[PDB]
Structure 1
Amino acid sequence: NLPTAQEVQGLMARFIELVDVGDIEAIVQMYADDATVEDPFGQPPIHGREQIAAFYRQGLKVRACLTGPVRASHNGCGAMPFRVEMVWNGQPCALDVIDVMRFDEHGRIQTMQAYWSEVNLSV
């Protein structure tokens, strides 16, 4: 069903867990079949599981961790702060991001927006 506030916290925490281990298939399955992703927020969105799988396969040796609690609403939405550690061309770097997600009545991510830019990168 439409995830409650407590359920949204668990779903979003799980999402970061999946990104951390790099299980591309488990990540893609968390999204609705026609979900849209705007990463970073400001650029045109990618639509559907095929494009999303390509996005995550391309983006993912990356370690991600929640840097604060998941903020959840009562209308199936949530927002969370986290850090992504990568090694950009031999040189290691970190990226601070905030993801905003809206879930559907099946508990899947319907839309996702990622807030970050070069100001949040540390290389």
Structure 2
Amino acid sequence: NLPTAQEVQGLMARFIELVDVGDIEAIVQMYADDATVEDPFGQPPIHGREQIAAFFRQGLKVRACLTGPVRASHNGCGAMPFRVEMVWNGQPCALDVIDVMRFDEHGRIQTMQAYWSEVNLSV
């Protein structure tokens, strides 16, 4: 069923947990088969689980954690603030991000928009 506000909080937190551990298959499974991802927002969207899987495999030594509670709505959507820590050619980096997600009637991520730019990056 369309996720309730409480369920959205759990689903989005789960997403962060999956990125943190780096389970690509589990992350991809959270998305609708034809979901769209805009990360960073403003960039062209990628479509489908294949493109989304390639995207995450490409990006995933990484750590991710919520930096504040997940804000959830009553229409299957939510937004959350988090921090990603990674390594770029042996160099430690950090990025502040906010993901906005819209879930479908099956509890899967239909669309995701990740807000961030170089002003939120530390290399």
Q: TM-score range by the shorter chain?
A: over 0.9
Unmatched segments (≥5 aa) in structure 2: none
CA distance in 2, matches of 1:88, 1:51: 22
Task: Say yes or no: does 1:79 pair with 2:79.
Answer: yes
* Residues 89-98 or 29-38, more deviating: 89-98
| Displacement of 1:105 | 0.3
Deviates more, 1:82-91 or 1:9-18: 82-91
- Shift in Å, 1:77: 0.2
* Identical counterparts, % of pairs: 99
Cα shift at 1:32: 0.1
The Cα of 1:90 is off from its aligned counterpart by 1.5
Q: Give the match's secondary structure for 2:14.
A: helix
- Paired residues, number: 123
Matched, 1:96 2:96: yes
Quote the offset at 1:16 in angstroms: 0.3
Q: Runs in 1 of length 4+ with deviation above 4 angstroms?
A: none
Deviation (angstroms), 1:104: 0.1
CA deviation after TM superposition for structure 1 residue 95, in Å: 0.2
Deviating more after overlay: 82-91 vs 92-101: 82-91
Provide the C-alpha distance between the structure 1 equivalents of 2:98 and 2:78, rounded to a whole number of angstroms.
Answer: 10
Q: How many angstroms does 1:26 deviate by? A: 0.3
Bigger CA drift: 81-90 or 32-41? 81-90
**Secondary structure in 2 matching 1:6:** helix
Alpha-carbon displacement from aligned partner over 1:8-39 (angstroms, at most 9, x marks no partner): 00000000000000000000000000000000
Under a length normalisation based on structure 1, what TM-score does the superposition of the two structures give? 0.99
For the residues of structure 2 that align with 1:74 and 1:22, how far apart are their CA atoms?
29
CA-based RMSD of the aligned residues comes to 0.5
Write the distance in 2 (CA, Å) between the matches of 1:7 and 1:65: 18
User: Residues 88-110 of structure 1, C-alpha deviation per residue, up to 9 Å, x if partnerless?
Assistant: 11111100000000000000000
- d(CA) in 1 for partners of 2:98 and 2:38? 12
Measure how far apart 1:122 and its partner are.
Answer: 1.2
Give unpaired runs (5+ residues) of structure 1.
none
